[PDB]
Amino acid sequence: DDNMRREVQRDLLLIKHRAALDPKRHYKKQRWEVPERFAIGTIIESTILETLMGDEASNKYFKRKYNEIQEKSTSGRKAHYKKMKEMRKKR
Amino acid sequence: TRKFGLVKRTLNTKKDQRLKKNQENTRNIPQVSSALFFQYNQAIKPPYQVLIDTNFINFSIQKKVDIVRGMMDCLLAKCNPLITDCVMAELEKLGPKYRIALKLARDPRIKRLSCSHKGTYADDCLVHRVLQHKCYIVATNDAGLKQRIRKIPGIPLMSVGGHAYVIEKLPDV
Amino acid sequence: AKLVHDVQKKQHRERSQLTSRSRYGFLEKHKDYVKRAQDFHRKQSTLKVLREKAKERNPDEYYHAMHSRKTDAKGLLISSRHGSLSMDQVKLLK
Amino acid sequence: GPYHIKYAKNGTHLLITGRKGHVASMDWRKGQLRAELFLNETCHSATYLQNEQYFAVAQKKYTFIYDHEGTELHRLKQHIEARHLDFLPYHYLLVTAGETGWLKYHDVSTG
Amino acid sequence: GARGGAKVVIEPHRHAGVYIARGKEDLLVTKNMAPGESVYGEKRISVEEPPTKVEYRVWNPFRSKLAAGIMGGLDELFIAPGKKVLYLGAASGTSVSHVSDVVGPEGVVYAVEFSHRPGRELISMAKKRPNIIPIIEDARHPQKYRMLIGMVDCVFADVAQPDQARIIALNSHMFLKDQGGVVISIKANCIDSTVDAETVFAREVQKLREERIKPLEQLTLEPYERDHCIVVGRYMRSGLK
Amino acid sequence: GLKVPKAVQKELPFKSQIHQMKPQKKKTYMAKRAVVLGGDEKKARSFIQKVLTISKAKDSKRKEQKASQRKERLKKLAKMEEEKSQRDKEKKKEYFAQN
Amino acid sequence: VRKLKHHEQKLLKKVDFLEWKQDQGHRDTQVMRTYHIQNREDYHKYNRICGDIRRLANKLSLLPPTDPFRRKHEQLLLDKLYAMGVLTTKSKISDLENKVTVSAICRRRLPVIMHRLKMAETIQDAVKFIEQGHVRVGPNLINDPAYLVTRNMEDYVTWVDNSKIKKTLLRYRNQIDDFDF
Amino acid sequence: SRVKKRKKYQKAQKKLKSVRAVYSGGQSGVYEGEKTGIKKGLTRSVKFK
Amino acid sequence: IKDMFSSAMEVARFEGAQIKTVSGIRGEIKRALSKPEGHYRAAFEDKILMSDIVILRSW
Ligand SMILES: [Zn+2]
């Protein structure tokens, strides 16, 4: 349906970028454009997003890894620039 | 309301389907053979199967080297020489001058391989067989064909040089 | 590496800004200067092209999109951030 | 006007060419207009080729071959000032004669 | 890995009648002809469809050589919805049931088996799947069950016999349509363990050409199986040249 | 980033006029209306923008890995080409010496 | 015609009802489409002028290379054609054969020059504006889309004063002065 | 010399896995799916000409 | 530039001398500034920064 439930939308977005979900899996290199037709289902014998964020090892990994990227991204930027223009000021 | 910029309708050569030029108009990566350890063919083992090239028979006669005995001497193993229909056809087309080579090629010890393609060109037929299955030795003295086989990894190449046969890419020797 | 000792290929350590000049910042080296020169030349190259485009503009150039597109009082193009609501639409939203 | 008329060999289609240059091809029984050209030119006569799909029009100086929908296919530069047109169905030859006093036979199949 | 409560995304495969279940891991699955039960204990996936509850069965490559072929990337698979398939060497429903799913209700599967013990479960399974016709007879003598089989679009053979080439040729001549499909599973050890696997594969391909079957592609089933390959061919009665 | 002078930006041809959206200062009604789901949705919306942050960074680093090994290869490649060019010249002197 | 079977094709190799050798590859139709020529015989009138240029150049070439007469006339022809705009360059005498073409003449028509001066988005649009009386060359309005503009006269191609198009140009930049209009 | 050849061979075994699929004993435990994913549009079969 | 020389008299001796920065930007001692003593004007092939240090090589 065109409604594209936000739970469904995030799940597909969480499969397109499944290479970053665990640093030990390293899947085959593919693109996986969203298919025209699909049917989500459970395994017979809790959404993936809800299942994944319930973990503690995975959450602690993303917070660390996300923080490390922010240090790279904010290095040399406006914040770094203002410090050097403040060092030239006496105090 | 007549339209502006009116033009006479005419045949559009680039976009007309009826014209022949306009009318005409899953990736595959072959697996590397499990019989091949880098450049070393582990699978191949005695008794060997050898594909005979047309020029090979002519040179063998020149040097007085029997096919079956010469093969056993070179590799020190039983060899099952194989002649495809292409090589047999090439020998027959050579003419009366090469009737001796045709007689030896029909020796009962030399086994025959059938072919399922129209052409009689034997160089291409041999190269296709070795690519599909890594279980043949190519016996040839043609300069062009030898270079093709050399590029293919794990295909032992045999030739007749000097007084007997010589095998190039067969580690067990 | 032929006929070269490992002693010859010894790293030469890089010097740092003087403490008296610590306020001014990091002492630029050749690699740092190349970053400045390359960036400046890139920007100046694009700017030079834009000026030539401005000089060679034809006052009589006409494009059908001129009706839709609008210009500010200063003379600069105005661009809608997202690209009015009818009352019937507002009543439902309210 | 005036209008020169040429029916198809089997009588299913009518080709009409006005002097001032109104050319129309139609299936007169079912009243379907296959093509209609408003060439601003002096047209003398027109004829159908092997069938209704193609027809020829003798215009001011050159003869033009047209398609079923009215698309121009060829301009016969060799036929000059043709005033009469005829088609030999079994030979696939187009015949022209006019002010030049020259009788020209043209093979439509091979051109 | 693929635990019970996990959720997956089902999308179609390149081959008609085969689906992929995406997630942290990918699974080859087929739509269940007889929902609610597993024939050999495979995992199953249920989808709520507008709502009827459709089910999908997981195809295990390590158990079915045909599935290993799909995993390995066969270009052409003549087994497709609405086609008649003659399955030779149908030990049980490990692979026949999945093939029955691919063909669907419109298609049929003629399961041929010789041993009576595996046949009895083949009967038990087939009563759940109306499109399966179990033929407990030797594939060596197709003339015995000629009454039971009509023309078949594709022939799939998983018989592990040294002279399977003769078995394939006889069945293809009687029941396979011209330009029809042939899919063979070849195990090197059963045919001749004296020579290497490659010599066996090259030798079997030659037999197929002699029997007017044109081989189209060859695939080895590693890492799922060792010294195994699948040969896909077309039955060209008119001419192979 | 480069800032074009306004005098130049004014007298630019129709095709090349830089589109520069001004910031909005008055609060729009839709900006005052839109509902943002808090609590559980906040935690499920911060999680995604973290995952997409890792994935973009990983691709941009593996992509930069190839560009480093592309430069190294083409240097090795050109060396092999040079050897085949000089030696090919020598053969064509050895041949035509016979002729 | 339906796609011919194999035995029919071998016996009907030269059959072609849509392409004939006398068509010369439908070059006329291709050039007419590119520059939107509305008169069917405009191409062949241009073709005769190109042939006249090429005939003269061929005769000039057969005069001895050091002839003063040959050099004078060849330069004059190069001088004149460049001024018209048919020839882009005056350097090479061989251009009189190789680079003298109907497309070169058609490329100097008013609709095309409007397109290159960006007065119109397409050649078809330029033809419509000419037919609608928006275009003047100097002080004269021209509604003929076949007017050839020399290099000197390309400076005077512009809109008519009271044209609605001019108002849009000035209104878009907020530079409209109603005193002029 | 023995140790260097030992490390060289085990190194080559790792590289052989990246060149082609290698049998590694088959299935171990419950089938947990194709871990690295399935590629719908890629075929590895060798085609006869 | 400053701190290279103590008085304008010294600068005049080195007028026209070749100098460079740590970054490698080459320049020249153009003229000595009247105020303060020792300061002087130089021209460089490209704009220099305040953090840069200019060097005159001598033996
Ligand atoms: Zn052959």
Residues whose CB falls within 8 Å of the CB of residue B59, separated by 6 or more in sequence, listed in order: B141, B160
Query: How close is the nearest chain B Cα to the Cα of E37, in Å?
Result: 35
| Mutant choice from A5, A14, A17 vs F, greatest count of F C-beta within 10 A | A17
Interchain contact C57–G (C-beta under 8 A): no
Phi–psi pair at B22, nearest 5 degrees: -75, -30
Cα distances from E25 to residues A19, A58, B151, E13, G89, in angstroms, run 11, 17, 39, 15, 67
For an interface test with H, give the residue of E217, E231, E234 to mutate (most H CBs within 10 A). Answer: E217
Q: Which residue of C has its CA nearest to A90?
A: C23
d(CA E111, CA E90): 6
Other Cβ atoms within 10 Å of C67 Cβ, number: 10
Taking alpha carbons only, the member of H13, H23, H30 closest to residue E224 is: H23
Q: Do chains B and C touch (3 or more CB pairs under 8 A)?
A: no
Q: Rounded to an integer, what distance in angstroms lies between the CA atom of residue G138 and that of residue G156?
A: 5
CB contact at 8 A, B31 and E223: no
Amino acid at G135: V
Which residue in the block uniquely carries the two structure tokens 């001066």?
A: G117
Residues 6+ apart with CB under 8 A from G118: C58, C61, C62, F13, F14
Contact (Cβ atoms closer than 8 angstroms) between residue B84 and residue B139: no
Q: And the tokens for E170?
A: 């006889």
Is the CB of residue E34 less than 8 Å from the CB of residue E93? no
Residue F39, amino acid = G
B38 to each of B167, C43, E200, how far by Cα in Å?
20, 51, 22
Residue of G nearest to C64 (CA): G121
Largest CA distance in chain E: 58
What whole-number distance in Å separates Cα of residue G131 and Cα of residue G110?
12
Q: Do the beta carbons of residue E132 and residue E126 sit within 8 Å?
A: yes
Question: Do E and I share at least 3 CB pairs under 8 Å?
Answer: no
In angstroms, the CA B109 to CA B111 distance is 6
Contact across the interface for E14 and B26, Cβ inside 8 Å: yes
Which structure tokens are listed for C23?
């306020």
Output the CA torsion sign for I40, I43, I47, I52.
negative
CA proximity to D13, closest of D1, D24, D21, D25: D25
On whether the CB atoms of residues E200 and E188 are closer than 8 A, the answer is yes
Gap between the terminal Cα atoms of chain A: 62
Q: Indicate the helix (H) or strand (E) that contains E19.
A: strand E19-22
Contacts of G166 in chain C (CB under 8 A): 60
DSSP string computed for chain F: -----HHHHHT--SSS----PPPP-SPPHHHHH-----THHHHHHHHHHHHHHHHHHHHHHHHHHHHHHHHHHHHHHHHHHHHHHHHHHHHHHHHHHH-
Find all residues with CB under 8 Å of B57, minimum gap 6, and list them. Answer: B67, B91, B101, B104, B105
Q: Which two tokens stand for residue B13?
A: 């050569």
Token output for E61: 């490559």
A49 to chain E, closest Cα gap in Å: 10
Distant-in-sequence, close-in-space partners of A84: CB < 8 Å, separation ≥ 6: C25
Name the residue among C82, C71, G178, G114 with its Cα closest to residue F14. Answer: C71
The single-letter DSSP state of residue C56 is T
CB-based burial label for B51 (10 Å; 0-12, 13-18, 19+) = buried
Q: List the structure tokens of E134.
A: 């179990």
Q: Residue type at D103?
A: L
Q: Do G37 and G31 contact (CB within 8 A), yes or no?
A: yes
- Give CA separation, G140 vs E65, F88, G144, G160, in Å: 85, 70, 12, 9
- List chain G gaps (C–N > 2.5 A) by preceding residue: none
Residue B142 near residue B30, CB atoms below 8 Å = no
d(CA D92, CA G14): 14
Q: G106 by DSSP, 3-state: which?
A: helix
Q: How far apart are CA D29 and CA G135, in angstroms?
A: 49
Resolution of the model in angstroms: 3.2
Q: Which residues of D touch B3 (CB under 8 A)?
A: none
Tell me the two tokens of residue A5. 């439930």
Q: Give the chain I residue whose CA is nearest to the CA of C41.
A: I46
User: What's CA C59's distance to the chain center, in Å?
Assistant: 29
CA distances from E158 to D37, D48, E86, E87, E184 (A): 69, 66, 11, 8, 6
Contact (Cβ atoms closer than 8 angstroms) between residue E96 and residue E33: no
Method: cryo-EM
| Cβ-based contacts of B43 with chain E (< 8 Å) | 196-198
Cα–Cα dist E150/E23, whole Å? 42
Which residues from A are below 8 Å from H39, CB to CB? 28, 30
Q: Which of B172, B35, B171 is nearest to E196 (CA)?
A: B35
- The residues with which E56 forms a beta bridge, in sequence order, are E31, E45
Helix, strand and coil percent figures for chain C, each rounded to 5: 40, 5, 55
Nearest to B32 by CA among B150, B138, B154: B154
For chain C, say whether G12 makes contact (Cβ under 8 Å): no
Contact: A49, F53; criterion CB under 8 Å: no
Task: Test A40 with E7 for CB contact under 8 angstroms.
Answer: yes
Residue I5: phi and psi, rounded to 5, are -130, 160
A84 Cα to chain E: minimum distance (Å): 47
As to burial, measured by CB atoms within 10 angstroms (0-12 exposed, 13-18 middle, 19+ buried), residue B27 is exposed
Note if the bond before F5 is cis, omega within 30 degrees.
Answer: no
Q: Which one of H33, H40, H41 has the shortest CB-CB distance to E25?
A: H33
Among G29, G36, G124, the residue with its CB nearest the CB of B11 is G29
Residues of A in contact with F39 (CB under 8 A): none
Please report residues of C whose CB lies closer than 8 A to that of A88.
23-24
Q: Do H49 and B32 touch (CB under 8 A)?
A: no
At residue C7, φ and ψ (nearest 5 deg) are -70, -40
CA distances B55 to B50, B93, B143, E210, F8, Å, are 14, 13, 11, 27, 78
Residues B82 and B109: beta-carbon distance below 8 Å: no
Q: How many residues does chain H have?
A: 49
Token pair recorded at residue D28:
């007169």
Residues whose Cβ atom is located within 5 A of ion ligand 1: B 84, 86, 115, 125
Which chain D positions have a beta carbon within 8 Å of B9's beta carbon? 70-72
Cβ(E73)–Cβ(E47) under 8 Å?
Answer: no
Write out chain F residues lying below 8 Å of A20, CB-based: 51, 54-55, 58
Cα B118 to averaged position of ligand 1 atoms, centre (Å): 8
Amino acid (one-letter) located at D43: C
Name B157's bridge partners: B138
Q: Of A16, A29, A30, which to mutate for an interface test with H (greatest number of H Cβ within 10 Å)?
A: A30
Q: What is the DSSP letter of G109?
A: B
Those of residues 2-31 in B touching chain D at CB distance below 8 A are 8-11
Assess F35–C contact: CB distance below 8 Å, yes or no: no
How far apart CA E61 and CA E72 sit, in angstroms, is 10
Answer whether H37 sits within 8 Å of A28, measured CB to CB: yes
For G40, name the nearest residue in chain D, comparing CA atoms only. D75
Q: Please state, in angstroms and rounded to a whole number, the distance separating the CA atoms of residues E55 and G132.
A: 68
Six-digit token string for B141: 């003295």
Q: From the CA of B116, how far away is ligand 1's center (Å)?
A: 7
Give the minimum alpha-carbon distance from C30 to chain I in angstroms, rounded to a whole number: 4
Identify which of D72, D48, D49, D51 has the alpha carbon closest to the alpha carbon of residue D62. D72
Which residues in C lie closer than 8 A to residue A84 (C-beta atoms)? 25
Residues 6+ away with beta carbon under 8 Å from B14 = B22, G30
Cα distance between residue I39 and residue I49, in whole Å: 17
* D73 in G contact zone (CB under 8 Å): yes
**C-alpha closest to that of G31 among G128, G113, G119, G105:** G105
Judged by CB atoms closer than 8 Å, whether chains meet at B10 and G127 is answered as no
D and F adjacent (3 or more CB pairs under 8 angstroms): no
Residue of A nearest to H41 (CA): A30
Closest residue of chain G to C73, computed from CA coordinates? G174
How far lies E94's CA from each of E59, E125, E148, in Å?
9, 10, 23
F95 Cβ under 8 Å from any chain C Cβ: no
- How far is residue C73's CA from residue C81's CA, in Å, rounded to a whole number? 18
Q: Does the beta-carbon distance from E26 to H34 stay under 8 Å?
A: yes
3-state SS string for chain B: CCCCCCCCCECCCCCCCCCHHHHHCCEECCCCCCCEECCEECCCCCCEEEEECHHHHHHHHHCCCCHHHHHHHHHCCCEEEEEEHHHHHHHHHHCHHHHHHHHHHCCCCCEEECCCCCCCCHHHHHHHHHHHCCCCEEECCCHHHHHHHHHCCCCCEEEEECCEEEECCCCCC
Distance (Å, rounded) from C-alpha I35 to C-alpha B135? 93
Chain centroid to CA A81: how far? 29
- Out of A14, A50, A72, the one facing F51 most closely (by C-beta) is A14
Give yes or no for E163 touching H (CB within 8 A). Answer: no
How many secondary structure helices (H) and strands (E) does chain D include?
A: 0, 11
End-to-end CA distance of chain B: 92
Amino acid letter, C32: D
Ligand 1 centroid, distance to B52 Cα (angstroms): 12
Q: Do chains B and A touch (3 or more CB pairs under 8 A)?
A: no
Query: Residue E141, Cβ neighbours under 10 Å: how many?
Result: 11
Put simply, the answer to whether B9 touches D72 (Cβ < 8 Å) is yes
